[PDB]
Each structure stands twice: as C-alpha cells, then as structure tokens.
C-alpha cells in the first residue's frame, strides 16, 4: 500500500524476542565453576527458525542486550562481563583462565544497577551471505573419513560465541538469573525457498521422523461445507 513501511522485509524481521536463557545460581550443579557460555543458535527456536528457510541466501546483522535479576527480581550491587568470541579465538576454560585478560577479545565492564545496556556486532561471516544449508560436508578440511576437531564449528558458517563471568577475587554474594534478547537492523535476502512446514526432529539438522502428520485435516469431504 501507500504506507508499506510496516509490510517490508525489515518490518517482517523487526522484532526483539527471546534468543538465549542462561542461569547462574549461587550454588548448584548446572555451573559449579561460576561461569557459563552460550552459542548463537537461531535455529534452536522453531519460531524464529521457520522464518529464515523462506529464503536460501540471506544477510543480517544483530544487536544484543543483557538483563541481570534475582529470582524475586531484586537489584544487587555487582558487575557481570560479556565478550564476543571470534571463531579463531579460544573459548575460556576456567574461571581463572588467561582468556579473560586477552586484549584482542573485545569486552566491556558493566554495572547491572545501570538499566540494561545493549551492544551490536556487524557482519562477521567471511562469505558474502549466510547459508543455512551447506549441500556438502560439514567440515571444510581435506579429510572426509575421520572425526576432525573442526567438525560442528566450521569457519564458513559459525558467527561467534559469548561467555559470561563475574570478575573479582572476592566471592560473589548473590544469585544471578540472566536473560538475552536480540534484534536485527539490516536484513536482505536473495532467493526464496519453499517453506518448511512439517514437524522437526533435530535441533539444527533438517532430518525428520517416519510418523507422518498433515498440516491440516479440518475439512472432512469436498461435498461437506
């Protein structure tokens, strides 16, 4: 229409929603080391995933934000860290790891009492556009018979990694609950792909299961209204 701004592909992708959920309890077994990590899995949520396979070649940026709250929702005087891990850089392995003080890894000091801060990452893919389907082998190496260390994390598709840590030699005094939101500014796609409609079986692999359901069965017969 004349006012078609709300109907464009940007508007069709203009929404900040739930992307990540990571918890850091004071004591427990989910993270007995005081820190956690999160891989960017857009395909994890079938809501946002089902959108992207409508096209095959697509480009998108993103911005990320962090929220710190207690199970009751109170605010406490502590700081938390966030840093982007490029594929070449190594992930942290311990709470006292040397990766925290690495200069080449961008990190920011943030006070959670300050209303939540938000950061953005530009286009990091070495290729021209993202490809959600790679019609070939997951690994880009010359070997096609072994279990290579580069399997799963290929330089041609991965788009980064985040880690969280509370810095300070003194022990943390409060429980933490962390929620993650993301949104895109520039989105551009080239070629449409038929929509994926049937039930999913795996979290990131389009393989499906032998029990067949149809998307609709409401209409009984042609003669029936």
């Amino acid at each position: 229409s004349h006012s078609t701004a709300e109907t464009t592909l940007d508007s069709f992708f203009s929404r900040a929603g739930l992307v990540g959920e990571i918890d850091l309890p004071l004591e427990g077994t989910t993270n007995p080391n005081g820190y956690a990590n999160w891989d960017i899995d857009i395909t994890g949520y079938a809501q946002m995933r089902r959108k992207v396979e409508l096209f095959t070649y697509m480009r998108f940026d993103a911005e990320f934000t962090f929220v710190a709250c207690t199970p009751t929702g109170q605010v406490v005087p502590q700081l938390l860290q966030y840093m982007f891990v490029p594929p070449g850089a190594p992930e942290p392995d311990s709470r006292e790891s040397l990766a925290w003080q690495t200069a080449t890894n961008p990190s920011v000091f943030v006070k959670l009492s300050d209303p939540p801060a938000q950061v953005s990452v530009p286009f990091m893919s070495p290729a021209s556009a993202y490809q959600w389907f790679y019609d070939g082998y997951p690994t880009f190496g010359e070997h096609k018979q072994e279990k290579d260390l580069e399997y799963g994390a290929c330089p041609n598709n991965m788009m980064g990694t985040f880690s969280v840590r509370t810095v300070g030699t003194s022990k943390s005094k409060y429980p933490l609950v962390i929620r993650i939101y993301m949104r895109m500014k520039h989105v551009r796609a080239w070629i449409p792909r038929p929509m994926r409609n049937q039930n999913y079986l795996f979290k990131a692999n389009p393989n499906y299961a032998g029990n067949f359901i149809k998307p609709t069965g409401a209409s009984r017969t042609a003669i029936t209204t």
Binding site: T56, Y57, A127, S128, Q131, F133, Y134, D135, G136, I191, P192, R193, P194, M195, R196, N197, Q198, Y200, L201, F202, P206, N207, Y208, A209, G210, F212, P215
Partner: protein
C-alpha cells in the same frame, strides 16, 4: 557432432520459456547430452537427480567433466515426454537450487552417524522418492511452484525447456566441491490408460552446457 552413427530424430517445435527474462553471463559447446530413457508407470511416484556429480558420466564432455573443476556455461535443459494422442497423465518439472537431500533416520533410536555412502551414491540412473509428498526431505510438495518450473500436460504439450544461470554460495565457486542444484520430476495426477494399450511412457531429458575448466594446484 555424431559419434559414428548417432543422428537422432529431434523436435523442432520446442516451447521457448525464459528464466526471469535473463540470459546467462560470461566468465564470473554444441554437444547435446543424452540420458537413458525413463519408464513412467501407474504406481510410480517420481524421481530426482543431482548435478553436477551424477552428470559427469552420461555426457560426452560430461565424462571429461569429471576431471574439470570450474564451470562457465549457460544451461538449456530440454525435457521430452512422447506419448500417444489417447493417453492420460500429468508431469511436473522444476529446479530446486541448493537442494539438500534429506536423509531418513528411522528405527527405535532417532540418531544416526555420518551419512552412509550407499545413500550418497544412488548411481547414474537415479533414485525413487520414499515419500514424495515431502520430497524425502520434510519439504512440502505443494510449494515447488515458487521456484522456476513448467507444466507438462499430455493433452497440451509433449516437451518443455528450462534455462538457468549459475547461482552459487560464493562469488568464487567450485563445481566439484559444492553441489549446485538438482531436477525434480513428480506426477500430480496418476496416469490412466485403456486395457491392452502401451503401459510404458518414455521420458528423456537433454541439456547442453558450454564448457568447464581444469584448474589444478601444486605444492
């Protein structure tokens, strides 16, 4: 252009269809490839093909294309379906870019290892769809028409053509490393015929790429 005595009878009244109104491009020829005839049956569910890996065995320059790395050509694909004037049937031809083959993970435990070489190699003849409603990939068959395609009806036509340029995942593309595309043929209305008539419908597909590149590297 004959290999000894290869002078087939070809149609001169093809129905010209253009793709997006765009002819192919330069660097970013008269050999007509011949494939084995396909038999269409009443209970048949449709077939599929994968290029360029399977294409490197049928063509005269295709056989040499096994050793050629890059491509630079325009595709004129001819699909031919000859039938009598009193036969019944309907066929769909379409091209699905970046067509990822859907493996089937059955059994009591829903987990499998790296795809077996048996599934990866169906041969140069082609394979049959296990459940053609989802194209054996969980992708609904209702939505193929958004991609380039053509309608083939026995009452209407006997041949069709498709022209598609090179679309790849990278500006610098490898044909022997990256699977480009594939062709899908599936019946929509099952073929019917009178008792005693010919029960086999021939299908032939013809394509004519221009040329490929050798490449090569040393240490």
């Amino acid at each position: 252009l004959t290999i000894g005595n290869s002078t087939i009878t070809t149609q001169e009244a093809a129905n010209i269809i253009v793709g997006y109104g765009e002819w192919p491009s330069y660097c970013s020829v008269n050999r007509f490839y011949t494939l084995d005839t396909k038999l269409w049956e009443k209970s048949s569910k449709g077939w599929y093909w994968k290029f360029p890996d399977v294409l490197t065995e049928t063509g005269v320059f295709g056989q040499n294309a096994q050793f050629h790395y890059l491509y630079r050509s325009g595709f004129c694909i001819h699909v031919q379906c000859n039938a009598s004037k009193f036969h019944q049937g309907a066929l769909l031809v379409a091209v699905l870019p970046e067509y990822v083959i859907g493996t089937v993970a059955g059994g009591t435990g829903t987990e499998d290892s790296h795809p077996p070489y048996k599934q990866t190699q169906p041969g140069a003849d082609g394979f049959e769809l296990q459940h053609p409603y989802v194209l054996d990939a969980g992708i609904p068959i209702s939505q193929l028409t958004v991609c380039p395609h053509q309608w083939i009806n026995l009452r209407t036509n006997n041949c069709a053509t498709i022209i598609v340029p090179y679309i790849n995942a990278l500006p610098f593309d490898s044909a022997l490393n990256h699977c480009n595309f594939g062709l899908l043929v599936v019946p929509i209305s099952p073929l019917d015929y009178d008792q005693g008539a010919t029960p086999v419908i021939p299908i032939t597909i013809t394509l004519a790429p221009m040329c490929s590149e050798f490449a090569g590297l040393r240490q």
